């Protein structure tokens, strides 16, 4: 990152104004840049072309809340009233000629998260080892976590009450002996700072 510099992460409150920076080196201070958006499971999208004087052209199907502006070697992507669907990696790009030949450089990318979203708490479903697996001397405990928003959960497993929308899951790989030799196991899920639990009982 020296032709183009981007900080690798940024976060903004839901519905606030968002401003991202891509800074050009001195040798390219007046160059025009392109902004791209990369979300999982989709093609990357051309967002806009942004000139040194701050003028720009967008889209694609790029909504009117995206705009650009400039200041010296800095190039800004702004999102007004940023929404959860604007979560993505934003990458800046620049073209040039180096002794006769065309060259293109991409920035390292800025991962943007949208904070302060309304919370929907998770529902947990747990399954004990199947009899088929137990006959092979294995035991996988399953914890399925669904109907929650926004994204992002942490999962901890407990045995005998002590340690050791969107979708998520956790698997605890045990032997059949380890399963049969506890009074209980518990999948504990943390979401936006709050805790939900469900237990399995080898005796049942």
């Amino acid at each position: 990152q020296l032709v183009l510099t981007q900080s690798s992460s940024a976060s903004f409150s839901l519905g606030a104004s968002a401003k991202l920076t891509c800074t050009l080196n001195s040798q390219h201070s007046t160059y025009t840049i392109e902004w791209y958006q990369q979300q999982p499971l989709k093609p990357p999208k051309y967002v806009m072309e942004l000139k040194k004087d701050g003028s720009h052209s967008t889209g694609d199907g790029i909504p009117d809340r995206f705009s650009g502006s400039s200041s010296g070697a800095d190039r800004y992507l702004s999102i007004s009233n940023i929404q959860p669907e604007d979560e993505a990696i934003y990458i800046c790009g620049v073209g040039d000629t180096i002794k006769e030949q065309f060259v293109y450089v991409f920035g390292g990318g800025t991962k943007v998260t949208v904070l302060g979203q309304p919370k929907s708490t998770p529902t947990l479903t747990v399954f004990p080892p199947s009899s088929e697996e137990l006959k092979e001397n294995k035991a996988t405990l399953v914890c399925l976590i669904s109907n929650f928003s926004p994204s992002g959960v942490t999962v901890a497993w407990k045995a005998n009450g002590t340690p050791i929308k969107f979708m998520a899951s956790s698997f605890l790989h045990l032997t059949s002996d380890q399963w049969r030799s506890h009074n209980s196991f518990t999948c504990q899920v943390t979401h936006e700072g709050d805790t939900v639990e469900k237990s399995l009982s080898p005796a049942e």
């Binding site: 999208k45 051309y46 790009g93 073209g95 293109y104």
Partner: peptide
């Protein structure tokens, strides 16, 4: 793309 855009449309990877 037109007027010298090099990366106008992308595949999914």
């Amino acid at each position: 793309g037109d007027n010298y855009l090099w990366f106008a449309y992308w595949g999914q990877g």
